[PDB]
Every structure is written in C-alpha cells, then in structure tokens.
Amino acid sequence: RYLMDPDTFTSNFNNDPLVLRRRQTYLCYEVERLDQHMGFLCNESGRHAELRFLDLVPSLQLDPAQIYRVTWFISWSPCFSWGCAGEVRAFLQENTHVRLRIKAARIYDYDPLYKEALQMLRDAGAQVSIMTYDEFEYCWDTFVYRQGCPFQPWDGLEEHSQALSGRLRAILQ
Amino acid sequence: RYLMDPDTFTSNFNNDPLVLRRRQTYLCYEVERLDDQHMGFLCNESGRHAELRFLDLVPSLQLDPAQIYRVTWFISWSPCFSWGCAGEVRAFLQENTHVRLRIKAARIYDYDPLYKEALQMLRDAGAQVSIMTYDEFEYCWDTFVYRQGCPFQPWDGLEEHSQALSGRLRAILQ
Ligand SMILES: [Zn+2]
Ligand SMILES: [Zn+2]
C-alpha cells in the first residue's frame, strides 16, 4: 500500500475549527471482514473522495455472502449539496452486507445542508463520529510514510476533538 | 384578507398520492394566542418553498415574545428535508420556544426521497404533524377560499386517501 507524505497528513487532518481551509478532503479507508483492503483517496477533478471510494468497491471483490465493516478516517464530514451523502446512502441500501463507520476530523459546514448529510447518513446506518487523538495517531501509524517516527500532536488536538464531537452529537441527537 | 380561487384550492389540496403533480405548495395558516389572530395563505415563489416564506413573514405579525402562540399550517405537501425546510423549521422553533406548531398535510411529499426524515425532525422539534381529513378540507374551503356561499364538494376517494396517508404518517412517527 502506498503511504502518504507526512506533511500532507498534518495539513489535511489538523482539526482546528477556526482555520479557513481549502475544500480538499483526504479519506483513509480500511475494510474488515466479519479481506483487509486499505488505502487513501482525495478529491480529484470535481469527484469527491467519498464517491471515488464507492467507485473502487467493485475492485475489492467483496463476497455478497460475507459481512464487512468499512471504516473511513476522513478529514471533512461528507457534503449534501454535491451528492456525496446521497450516493453513500444509495450504496448502503444496495449493499446491506456492508456496515460503514465514518470518523471525521472536521465538520464540513461550508455546505448549507451539512446537518442533513450527517442526519441522513446516520438514518441509513452509518456510524458517524469525530476523530480523537487515538484515531489520529492510528492513522499516522498506518497510512503515513513516517519512517518509524511517532505521531506528534498539533496544538489543542484534544480540545478541538471534544468541541467538534459535542457539536456533532447535538446535530444527531 | 384575500381569498383563494376555488379551482386553485381543489387542484392543490386533492389528496390522491399517485397523481403526477407540479412541485407547487399552498400553505393556509392561522396564528392565535393561547391562554390576536392572523390568517392567510402562501405558495412557493421563484424557488422559495411556502414554508420558508411563512417564516419570512413572522416578524411582520408582531408577535409578543412573552405570550404563547399556536400556529396551524394547512399545507398541501408535507415539508421537505432535502431542500432545507424541516431544518429551517426546527431552527425557528428552537429560537421561538413560545410557538406551538401544528402541521396538517394534504399529502406526504413523496417527491423527496428523504421525506421521512423531515417528518421525524419536525416531530422531534415539537411540531404536531397530521394528515388532513374531510373535516380539515371543508374547514379550509369554508375559511380560505372565495367560495361565494357554495358548500365543500369532496373529490373521489378523499376519505380513503386520508386514512391511508394517515396510516403511513403514524407508522413513520411511531
Ligand atoms: Zn461531497
Ligand atoms: Zn421544502
């Protein structure tokens, strides 16, 4: 599996919510059978990382008779107004042997309907939560070309995660 | 104030759910204080759904923030999810805790794939959502329509459609 540049990880997964950022998304994924496929994806030429993950599901050749858990570690929560939540809902309805967990570093409130995205994905069976220190370091250790160097947290990581988690839990309550 | 044309009422509040319709909405409203009345109707205009146009006019009603008000919507379609109506109504009710909102819908907005999420979100926000029955159609005819003394005439299957839709709604909200 090809490993991500460390600078790319840190700049995209920093969870300080008061920074204006570009609308790029990185999506680290793992699939577990209940196979083990793993990798990462970004938005490319108008196609959001979430839909690019859906595009490659056929190449994973999942057994329809087997149950799989798909985990996304994603730098932004999925949008509504550009079709991501809708395509992801359709995929879950069409592939009931798949259970999806979405762990988001930040909430994508640049979309006016971002709350509708989170709420509808929850209703479709996705488990949506905000990334914590544990997940950030796991991603550093798993998807990043770190050359044996340990994860070094950015300032306020824990406070930002708890603040965003409280906001997400209020949206979904 | 101003009364609706009868053909406009009949074509917009017909409750046959299997009819291909234009995505226009009519919303007849009543506002009363509980222990001061406003009434009117609204449709979608230039893309803005009637529900949001009602929220737009709340300031001009000059409601006392200290008093409780019951707002009743007789609305031809239940409010949508995918274009933001349910979310905007939830925000308004959270910001205006002295409003008690009752939504009586002629039809369920099946054109929205996420219509069930809208209904559940409105219930969770404190709105009482129900399906219009013969009683409500006739009340609206008697109240909001330029009927010139003519009685309400039901369309085919009115009662059957209302009970079927009511059963769907109650199952969604159980
Ligand atoms: Zn998207
Ligand atoms: Zn709407």
Author numbering:
A (entry chain B): 190 to 223, 232 to 241, 250 to 378
B (entry chain A): 190 to 224, 232 to 241, 250 to 378
The authors write:
The APOBEC3 family of single-stranded DNA (ssDNA) cytosine deaminases plays important roles in innate immunity against viruses and transposons. However, a subset of APOBEC3 proteins, most notably the nuclear-localized APOBEC3B (A3B) enzyme, is strongly implicated in causing mutations in various human cancers. Human A3B consists of tandem zinc-coordinating cytosine deaminase domains: an N-terminal domain with a pseudo active site and a C-terminal functional catalytic domain. The active site has a catalytically essential zinc ion coordinated by two cysteines (Cys284 and Cys289) and a histidine (His253), with the fourth position of tetrahedral coordination available for directly interacting with the transition state of the hydrolytic cytosine deamination reaction.
The crystals have two protein monomers in the asymmetric unit, each containing a zinc ion bound in the active site. Loops 1 and 7 of A3B(187–378)QM_Δloop3 in the new crystal form show different conformations from those observed previously. In both A and B chains of the new structures, the loop 1 residue Arg211 is flipped out and, instead, the adjacent residue Arg212 projects into the DNA-binding groove and interacts with loop 7 Tyr315. In contrast, Tyr315 in chain B shows an alternative conformation differing by a rotation about the Cα-Cβ bond, in which the Tyr315 side chain is flipped away from loop 1 (χ1 ≈ 180°, trans). Importantly, this trans conformation of Tyr315 was also observed in the open state crystal structure of the A3Bctd active site bound to a TC-containing ssDNA substrate, where the Tyr315 side chain lines a hydrophobic pocket that accommodates the –1 T base. However, in our new apo A3Bctd crystal form, Tyr315 in this alternative conformation maintains the cation-π stacking interaction with the guanidinium group of Arg212. Accordingly, Arg212 in B chain is positioned differently from that in A chain, but is still blocking the ssDNA-binding groove. Of note, the two datasets we collected using different cryo-protectants showed a slight difference in the conformation of Tyr315 in the B chain. In the new crystal form, Arg210 is released and flipped out, replaced by Arg311 that in turn occupies the pocket between α1 and Trp281. The three distinct conformations of the loops 1 and 7 observed in the apo (DNA-free) A3B(187–378)QM_Δloop3 structures collectively represent possible modes of regulated ssDNA access to the A3B active site, in which the closed state of either loop 1 or 7 (or both together) is incompatible with substrate binding.
